[PDB]
Amino acid sequence: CKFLIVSSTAGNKREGVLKELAVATKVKKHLQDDMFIIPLAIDENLSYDDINIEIVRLNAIDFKKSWAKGLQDLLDAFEKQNVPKKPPDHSKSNLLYQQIFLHDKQAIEKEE
Amino acid sequence: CKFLIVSSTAGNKREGVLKELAVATKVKKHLQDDMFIIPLAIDENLSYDDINIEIV
């Protein structure tokens, strides 16, 4: 429903992110919605004029000097763009966090 | 060295020419050259008011 592209220093020259941006541009042209792509800028060292072109037209979101207000404006832009949602629950987040990020960092049951 | 943009009727709505114009403005404020962009007026039905912002 919404596309989020990170316009990082290394996120504007890799082939994969540019190809994903190209197919995102194609599907946003098919869907005829300009709010499909929401760019994300996180590095101050990358100037505004050095980004790839699909980030030039859209105003890239603010995530550089702080993250809390950036997440807040992303959230309120989302709910003002009327994205369907579920009630908040961190239990799914907790389950995912225990699922992926604790796959090689846990004690095992072996004899030592 | 110089940017030439056709400011026709099809040169306004089309996304690619607008994108090239935007990065032309970026490189013209990079190079401190106000003469970097040379607009080209082809269509007669298009006046000087209905062009896009970066051409006015």
Added chain:
Amino acid sequence: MRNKIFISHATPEDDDFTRWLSLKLIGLGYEVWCDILFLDKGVDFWSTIEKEIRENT
């Protein structure tokens, strides 16, 4: 149908007065458009600027 109120300013060198004026006119009962409030980040600007200027301002 053109009733929008357009405010142009040097972002962000005059953000405070623009914000206060936009809030005051939108609480007074005027549909006021400004770059800070309605043009939130993540939105294309210049096409929307043109459409508001030539359509609703």
Added chain:
Amino acid sequence: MKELIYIEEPSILFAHGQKCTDPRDGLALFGPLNQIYGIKSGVVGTQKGLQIFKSYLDKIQKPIYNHNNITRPMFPGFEAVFGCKWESQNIVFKEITDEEIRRYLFNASTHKRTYDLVTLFNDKIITANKNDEERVDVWFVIVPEEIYKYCRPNSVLYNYDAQFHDQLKARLLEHTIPTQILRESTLAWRDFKNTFGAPIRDFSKIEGHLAWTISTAAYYKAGGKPWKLGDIRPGVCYLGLVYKKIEKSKNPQNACCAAQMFLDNGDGTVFKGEVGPWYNPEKGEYHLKPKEAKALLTQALESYKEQNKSYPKEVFIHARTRFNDEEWNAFNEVTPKNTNLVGVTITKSKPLKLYKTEGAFPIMRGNAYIVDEKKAFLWTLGFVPKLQSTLSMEVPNPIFIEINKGEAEIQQVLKDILALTKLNYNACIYADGEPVTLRFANKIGEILTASTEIKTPPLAFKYYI
């Protein structure tokens, strides 16, 4: 043939009732249990310290990285990790003239220099918060490096203590002001080098830990609770009892005991144990005479009644010395018949270095070695897989525990002190060897022993760490 039983890694609660095991990652993912509306920083020091603190605070505002997030996680910004706002504006600053520093420098004995400088900072803070209308939740004392270096207790060109922050918090204890002293070289290491031309206070890779510790200390001293313990039974009270002795010359040290208390949350309610001129320093066996023992027990029971309204069903006592019979007999009859009293001794001097056959890895943290029903071992130090590194250094050394009196499950107190080891607040490390009731014990004893002139210390924790 004995084995080593396993105790599961204890869990700490977080925002929205979420359960994790790491405080840094849990804070970065969920945040504090209770929110505060905002803090206002106050600073005392030179204008150089002021700009250094401002630079470090705006650096903290930015998301800063480290080498890798496996051991030392990145800082996502104070606002994104705590939900509170930190700004470089509305900050109250008080300047100290360096000419006064020069005037105080040429004194003969450094002790009176320490006294006058400490009192100058103290009454500067008192004047600052007694006139300024702007509330200051936490005062940041930016001490200069050369003051910490050239005015050391043995630096070469009685109840008052030669340590700077000891006397600072001791004489600031009587006005309920949460302060935190910041060494200048800690947050000005960029321009600080040694004689060779290198930063001896180097954080070229590790400054994320500094940001984490400073941020969590600032949030804790503000009033908000960063994290608490997961499971606490209805009627269990922990009593981490201090048994640290000072060497207070011919003044009778006797027993400078204090006590920490955890009852339902991470809230510590420290009530001042008596100085107790009985048993002069020739008799330093920490044998509490019955009147002070019952007074301390009454203090603990009254605090539990004030915070819980219900009588506790079991009292957990943590200390580090052996317990004699008469002290426990005094501890018994005051307690009601329904409750239970048990005492645990924690020590480090017992040597037990468990080595590894293959590879170069230490003992995984959480192993428990049981010798008898009374005596047991707990490996609170060593490798932990959530960190993918060892918290200990070289070879970890365990803490020898031993229940003296009362009937209780040994694995119960093992897992309970394991949970108690996770509640460190001054430093945002994963865990420490000694439990936090014993970790705070020595420092709060040093705080209380630096000012005899007080009589009712506040029982909070912001004015101590």
